[PDB]
Ligand binder design. Structure first.
Ligand SMILES: CCCCCCCC/C=C/CCCCCCCC(=O)O[C@@H](COC(=O)CCCCCCCCCCCCCCC)COP(=O)([O-])OCC[N+](C)(C)C
Ligand SMILES: CCCCCCCC/C=C/CCCCCCCC(=O)O[C@@H](COC(=O)CCCCCCCCCCCCCCC)COP(=O)([O-])OCC[N+](C)(C)C
Ligand SMILES: CCCCCCCC/C=C/CCCCCCCC(=O)O[C@@H](COC(=O)CCCCCCCCCCCCCCC)COP(=O)([O-])OCC[N+](C)(C)C
Ligand SMILES: CCCCCCCC/C=C/CCCCCCCC(=O)O[C@@H](COC(=O)CCCCCCCCCCCCCCC)COP(=O)([O-])OCC[N+](C)(C)C
Ligand SMILES: CCCCCCCC/C=C\CCCCCCCC(=O)O[C@@H](COC(=O)CCCCCCCCCCCCCCC)COP(=O)([O-])OCC[N+](C)(C)C
Ligand SMILES: CCCCCCCC/C=C\CCCCCCCC(=O)O[C@@H](COC(=O)CCCCCCCCCCCCCCC)COP(=O)([O-])OCC[N+](C)(C)C
Ligand SMILES: C[C@@H]1CC[C@@]2(OC1)O[C@H]1C[C@H]3[C@@H]4CC=C5C[C@@H](OCCC(CO)CO)CC[C@]5(C)[C@H]4CC[C@]3(C)[C@H]1[C@@H]2C
Ligand SMILES: C[C@@H]1CC[C@@]2(OC1)O[C@H]1C[C@H]3[C@@H]4CC=C5C[C@@H](OCCC(CO)CO)CC[C@]5(C)[C@H]4CC[C@]3(C)[C@H]1[C@@H]2C
Ligand SMILES: [Ca+2]
Lengths: 92, 92
């Protein structure tokens, strides 16, 4: 689950924030939102950052259209496969 | 699941956006919100677009009152039946 998380969190932060010097925030921002997705928070108005109803209209730029596709795959794997695999373990 | 999705996404976009020329957005807007519903995002302030607490007060018009009924059926089928059918598969 933590691997699937970084599989998603690192490409997202890299696509959306491409002018980042090294910082401790980079360690927070690759775990924070991907973790709250596990609990069904999809951050609906932040997925497409070039949409008109975006809450993040300023990080629109090249490649950012990739992040919906990424998150669609992430949640299917994380929210459906991996959480219910853990539940299946707990059921046993 | 993708069929149930378009069963809902196409009537919604057609009822709510009736003056649309052909566009690539039509391909996004028939998949985008119906997919995030699968993960429990109901877009609560967008369902009834003629309600006072609406975030979409401008797409109010004829037929738009049909879209709550549509989405009520969609999520029951998608969120409850189809996701837990997939989970039941995964459990086996
Ligand atoms: C045993 C269970 C798991 C394994 C254990 C190991 C887990 C690994 C743990 C990793 C921790 C992540 C690194 C933290 C360090 C960076 C924070 C920091 O310094 O800066 C940030 C602050 O940070 C905070 O205020 C705290 C944020 C912590 C979030 C942890 C919970 C999220 C889920 C995590 C769980 C995932 C587990 C995955 C499981 C599926 C902000 O940056 P800044 O530079 O301070 O900015 C200052 C300016 N400002 C005030 C405007 C902000
Ligand atoms: C099912 C429902 C879908 C319909 C199906 C048919 C596919 C339809 C697809 C057709 C592809 C053509 C559409 C893109 C043309 C450019 C338009 C555009 O603005 O793009 C935008 C992004 O997107 C891109 O730049 C490219 C997106 C490609 C995604 C399609 C992958 C294949 C989908 C499955 C293939 C189907 C068959 C296989 C299925 C098993 C440009 O950018 P932006 O995001 O606006 O923001 C960035 C910054 N900006 C604003 C400054 C620019
Ligand atoms: C293998 C598993 C699935 C089967 C495979 C096939 C999957 C089918 C995939 C279909 C892809 C849909 C077509 C997208 C391309 C058209 C959009 C476009 O060109 O422009 C849009 C950009 O688009 C984006 O920024 C990305 C949007 C992609 C959303 C994908 C995630 C949702 C779930 C998908 C998965 C659900 C699948 C169902 C599963 C239950 C914006 O519109 P525009 O006109 O560019 O507007 C420009 C102006 N603006 C800047 C203000 C915006
Ligand atoms: C169970 C709890 C419910 C009570 C039960 C009894 C049913 C009560 C129902 C009674 C029906 C009469 C009410 C509507 C009258 C018009 C009023 C109106 O403004 O309508 C609005 C919507 O709605 C419609 O336009 C029609 C809605 C019909 C829905 C009923 C389906 C059957 C439900 C089950 C039947 C029950 C028994 C079977 C059960 C197995 C029109 O306007 P708007 O949506 O605001 O926006 C549009 C644009 N505008 C603002 C510019 C106008
Ligand atoms: C045309 C669709 C073709 C048909 C669709 C199907 C083909 C799919 C292929 C491609 C989809 C189409 C890509 C075109 C993007 C157009 C927008 C663009 O230029 O965005 C940006 C560049 O974007 C790039 O340079 C993207 C480069 C490709 C990335 C690699 C994709 C690999 C997919 C892996 C495949 C695995 C698939 C899944 C496996 C199961 C720049 O423009 P902007 O966004 O406006 O940014 C602001 C620009 N500014 C700096 C001037 C301010
Ligand atoms: C009164 C009802 C009594 C009982 C109803 C209950 C019985 C059901 C029957 C009917 C529901 C009642 C509809 C009333 C609509 C009133 C509002 C209206 O006119 O809206 C609009 C038109 O709306 C239409 O023209 C709708 C036409 C019916 C669509 C087909 C329904 C099929 C239901 C399938 C059944 C399957 C059931 C489920 C199967 C298990 C116009 O008004 P507006 O919204 O203000 O728009 C702005 C107008 N403007 C352009 C001037 C600015
Ligand atoms: C197998 C796994 C692959 C992924 C991973 O684990 C192992 O690999 C680790 C490497 C880590 C980075 C190493 C160095 C730094 C530099 C630091 O810069 C100083 C700050 C500055 C403040 O301004 C001083 O003044 C910022 C943090 C950063 C980028 C780490 C982030 C987390 C990373 C990416 C970790 C990640 C979870
Ligand atoms: C069995 C399944 C039934 C549903 C479905 O799959 C098969 O049937 C497909 C047919 C597709 C449309 C075909 C043609 C176009 C024209 C294009 O217009 C150019 C843009 C313009 C920009 O301004 C050029 O300049 C916009 C897209 C659109 C409407 C398609 C949308 C997706 C649709 C509805 C697909 C949908 C998922
Ligand atoms: Ca939820």
């Amino acid at each position: 689950m933590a691997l699937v998380l970084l599989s998603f969190g690192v490409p997202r932060k890299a696509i959306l924030y491409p002018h980042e010097e090294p910082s401790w925030s980079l360690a927070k921002d690759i775990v924070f939102h991907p973790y709250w997705m596990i609990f069904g928070e999809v951050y609906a108005y932040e997925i497409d950052v070039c949409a008109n109803d975006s809450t993040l209209p300023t990080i629109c730029g090249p490649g950012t259209w990739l992040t919906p596709f990424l998150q669609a795959v992430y949640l299917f794997v994380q929210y459906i496969i991996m959480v219910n695999l853990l539940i299946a373990f707990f059921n046993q």
